[PDB]
Amino acid sequence: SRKVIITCAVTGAIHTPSMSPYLPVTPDEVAQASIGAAEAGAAVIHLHARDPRDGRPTQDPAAFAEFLPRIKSNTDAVINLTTGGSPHMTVEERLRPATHYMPELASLNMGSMNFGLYPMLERFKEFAHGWEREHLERSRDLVFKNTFADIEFILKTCGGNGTRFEFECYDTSHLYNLAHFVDRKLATPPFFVQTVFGLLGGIGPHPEDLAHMRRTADRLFGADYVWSILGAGRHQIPLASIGAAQGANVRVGLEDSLWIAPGELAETNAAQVRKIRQVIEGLSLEVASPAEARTMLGLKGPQNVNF
Amino acid sequence: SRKVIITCAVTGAIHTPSMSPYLPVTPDEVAQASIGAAEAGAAVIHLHARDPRDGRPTQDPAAFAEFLPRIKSNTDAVINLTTGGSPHMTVEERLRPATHYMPELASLNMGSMNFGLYPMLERFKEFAHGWEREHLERSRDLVFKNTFADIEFILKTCGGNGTRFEFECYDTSHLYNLAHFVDRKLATPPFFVQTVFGLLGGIGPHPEDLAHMRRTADRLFGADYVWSILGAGRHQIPLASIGAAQGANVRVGLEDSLWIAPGELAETNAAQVRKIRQVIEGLSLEVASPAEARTMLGLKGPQNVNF
Amino acid sequence: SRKVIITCAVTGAIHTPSMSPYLPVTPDEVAQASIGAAEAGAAVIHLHARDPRDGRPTQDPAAFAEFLPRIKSNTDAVINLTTGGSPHMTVEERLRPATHYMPELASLNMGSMNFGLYPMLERFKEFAHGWEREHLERSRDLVFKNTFADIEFILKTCGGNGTRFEFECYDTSHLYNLAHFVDRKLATPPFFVQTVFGLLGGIGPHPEDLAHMRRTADRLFGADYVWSILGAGRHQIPLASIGAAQGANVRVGLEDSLWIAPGELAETNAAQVRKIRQVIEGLSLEVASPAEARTMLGLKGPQNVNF
Amino acid sequence: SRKVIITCAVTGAIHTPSMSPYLPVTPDEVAQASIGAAEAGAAVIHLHARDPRDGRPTQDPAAFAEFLPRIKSNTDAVINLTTGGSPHMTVEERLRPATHYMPELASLNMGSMNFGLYPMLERFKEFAHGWEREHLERSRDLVFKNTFADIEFILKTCGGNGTRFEFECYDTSHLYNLAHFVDRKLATPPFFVQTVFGLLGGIGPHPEDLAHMRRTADRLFGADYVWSILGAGRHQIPLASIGAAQGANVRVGLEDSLWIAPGELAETNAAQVRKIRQVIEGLSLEVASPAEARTMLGLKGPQNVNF
Ligand SMILES: [Zn+2]
Ligand SMILES: [Zn+2]
Ligand SMILES: [Zn+2]
Ligand SMILES: [Zn+2]
């Protein structure tokens, strides 16, 4: 298909509340962020939950109980639940929302890696909540763990529930890790490969980095994968644009970037969706509907989730 | 400078009038086309002249005599004259407009090559004028000659007058050909390098082709060049977008593509300038004014031309 | 096949006899060079003729009349005749030897280009014959002409005799030119693609240049091409090695480089064949025999030529 | 310098003794392996220790006590100690040898990653010691931890003893992680960058993977890094060859590959040094002596160590 799938990651677990008043924190804010992103043109909504009180990341399925059914009734957009949450968290817990809610899509980080969030402390030096500075400073000695055993376990369990994955690949090794699983017939096509650029601990944001992730994926998966680009921070729209211009899909959201322009905070997820849509439109491309995305990605349908 | 220079090539010598009623032909059309593109945001107007009776290319300086002053009186956009014109034509004669008019910019094809235009005879079967079919078929057996001696001659002759060049580079060899002249101290920075993609006889339009040209230019010239992208035909906006997303400048225009969208003919050069501007705006980038383009390219000034 | 085909180009038309006493000139020297290179392991001998009195290039078939049958009676190596000769020569004159001798292989330059030989005048300043300096200096205003019409003519005329081609591609555009002919069905597989690096007027000799020719050829031709590398001068063995290590075939010979090591003239063609064989053996690869080359390239056989 | 530094990794912690009777286990074997490699041309010996009763990896400084002085007394080859050892082991234990012996070089893995060793159980089914199968199977569920804090600690601690590092970069993210520390001035040039290809959990062995690692490094470090290539298993010689041909340094050894040719076990480490030297010689390059490698790498000297 020539339609462009816009995934919008509304809040995540990396950014903290003190960085931007626009980062969704409460169940209502997450729901509104999502419906607005979807209304703006996002076919897939990539969701994390946070504590309505202080915004700290939470993977308790309780935290999703309110917004999921609310999003589902307010938009046909595809709900995509994180199996990652915060890198500080631990496995099997991380999988509760996905295992409980049995979503059409869940995110799967394709390899253990460092996540260097501490440099954000050079831009943000004062925080409303104590957990914020800690979350960033402790990133320095934490490993985001997704071993070959962890990945196999997620694939079997969630796959068993009709849940397909957004394979988050932060470097060439992640595409090769995915290839390993594909060869073992543990994942079935099409593979939704979200190539992530610009995070310390992952591949950088250079145009050469993007071209290499594409040539690798093309060589390893051929016609069996569906490509999406995720550029962190300021690289969000330019890397998405480069990919859009050559047939890729795009991912935006306050989870990945807090900005709408140099030195200007994005007020809503929808704003970012709008901006990538101006590029998509200039390229004479059309944005994919949730129905189109479901077809392109081989998803189970909204009537088949536990919510 | 983070500003994007938009070059608009208004008519050229490749397309023929029977392929689109919007291709400018007469001096008034060429002038209106240029003025409108400049007002849409083009800082540089790349110009060829056509015979007003049948639209065939002509490098007779008399053919530019009316439209040149008319453009100059209505816009401060930089006038860029071609030193090629038609590959059917010969050298030093090819230089008459640039040597006479002493423009701020002149284009310079960086190497002898084949120009395969004959395949257009498969989309366009009926022509109003006899020359059109012949122009296209005769490209099969002709070489666009730009020898190392010819290039040296153009660099010396036009450069002596303060004319700077739009170095038209159709393949890697052209970049290496320019480095040869830079190493002989026959060209001085900044080098306005227009990498041209998608013409039979030149490099193709794949994203790998574009990344190759950039990495070569980066290695050969470092910070001493100013990069512009020209994608032929349907590749105009996609390749320009890829470049613009990574700091490059852009070239549009009916000389290069007759289209505004799939199967939809562009009514004006301005429309193509508006189309690439949606992408430039999506990227939160600004368009360079003619004054800014002059500074970026080291040009002599709108008043310092012989028209 | 994992066997490596070694082509040896014994004299060429670029180098001049005053540059090295080891450059073959007379029919006896050419035959000895050829036989020696075949005995060293070259399965393909790429041939030009020179005038025995002064070494000047000549495409007169009479100039090949002695050495050709002598090489044929002494080795089963594949004889590959140039259709390029000297770029100073005219076309169809260039074709006399290949059309008369109906060889198994003929070289075919895939596009018009500049051929800058004049910088060699900076290293070689004394010449025994006046034509030598002239040959070099005059390359400055020379186009090496191989229009789309010329290539079509050679393909049809030589191809009609069962002659297959060593497609000499000096840049990306040449690979795209070849795909144009493959699509029009004017050339049948396998395609023996000789990617040529390091000639002024061609693509350079950077590892990036080699990697780009390969990825382009792979995309355009898939499994239908047989790849060979030709690195000019000092790049001969380094580039051939980078290629051999990833499945390529290799071209060596005094036509392409006069050197065996830095500042050290190669005394024979054989010496260069032995140097690449050292690399091939280090890689645990084997050299293809003439019979094996013939199978890999679909050749008509040593007895099926007109000499 | 155009001299090639050959690093020989004599045993490592990946391979198990049941895999090859030639894998060095005892102090005597390690020392003779190291001296033979140096005699064959290795300027740098990359060392791990094994428990001599069962060959299991051990980072007890006591396991190095005999071989280090034996090696130092018989060769000037630079001693390079591992800081990884077995990915099963912990961090304080990992650093004892380097911190105690204060070698001129120590290896430093540049990012936490999965190490997929379990596929080797498809080739090796029978093991002499119980630890061997467990070593391989437990790789499925273990992370090789090298956090941003860990790396900072190693740089400060070992750096303080004059020890310089062989930065083992298994993917693009590792080069970027090194750039982070270089920007923080926590490592001084020249940086010995050992790019590692072909391990499940790291970047693969494709020529493109290699070109991208060089392009990334060239861009991040410019002239401030010294490049070495490590291809795992069968990719050992081809990838080293590709690097050697373009000015890089090379790494061989039974730690990295058990083979000397397809299906033929390497009898010694020295056999592998000889094999890459066939390529080096074919390329007309010379091997660096230990004195030369010390200059190239800015090393402290063979007597400035604690053994
Ligand atoms: Zn997420
Ligand atoms: Zn033009
Ligand atoms: Zn030749
Ligand atoms: Zn090691």
Side-chain angles (χ1 to χ4, degrees), chain B residues 169-170 195-199 203-206 209-211 213-214 227-233 235 239:
Chain B
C169 295
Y170 296 77
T195 49
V196 185
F197 304 95
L199 182 53
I203 194 164
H206 195 276
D209 297 326
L210 178 154
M213 294 296 289
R214 184 186 168 178
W227 189 30
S228 186
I229 284 61
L230 192 192
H235 308 287
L239 290 186

Side-chain angles (χ1 to χ4, degrees), chain A residues 112 114 118 140-141 143 146-149 152 171-173 176 180 184 201-202 204 206 208-209 212 215 219, chain D residues 112 114 118 140 143 145-150 152 171-173 176-177 180 201-202 204 206 208-209 212 219:
Chain A
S112 299
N114 295 340
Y118 57 91
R140 188 190 305 265
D141 183 58
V143 174
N146 287 86
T147 66
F148 288 113
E152 182 183 334
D171 211 348
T172 340
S173 65
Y176 280 103
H180 174 79
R184 291 166 59 188
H206 196 274
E208 291 287 11
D209 293 323
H212 187 76
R215 80 175 65 93
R219 193 178 56 250
Chain D
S112 302
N114 298 341
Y118 58 89
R140 187 189 307 271
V143 168
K145 169 179 181 292
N146 290 290
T147 64
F148 289 111
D150 291 337
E152 187 181 344
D171 207 351
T172 335
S173 61
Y176 278 109
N177 291 344
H180 173 70
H206 192 280
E208 295 281 10
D209 291 326
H212 191 66
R219 190 176 66 253

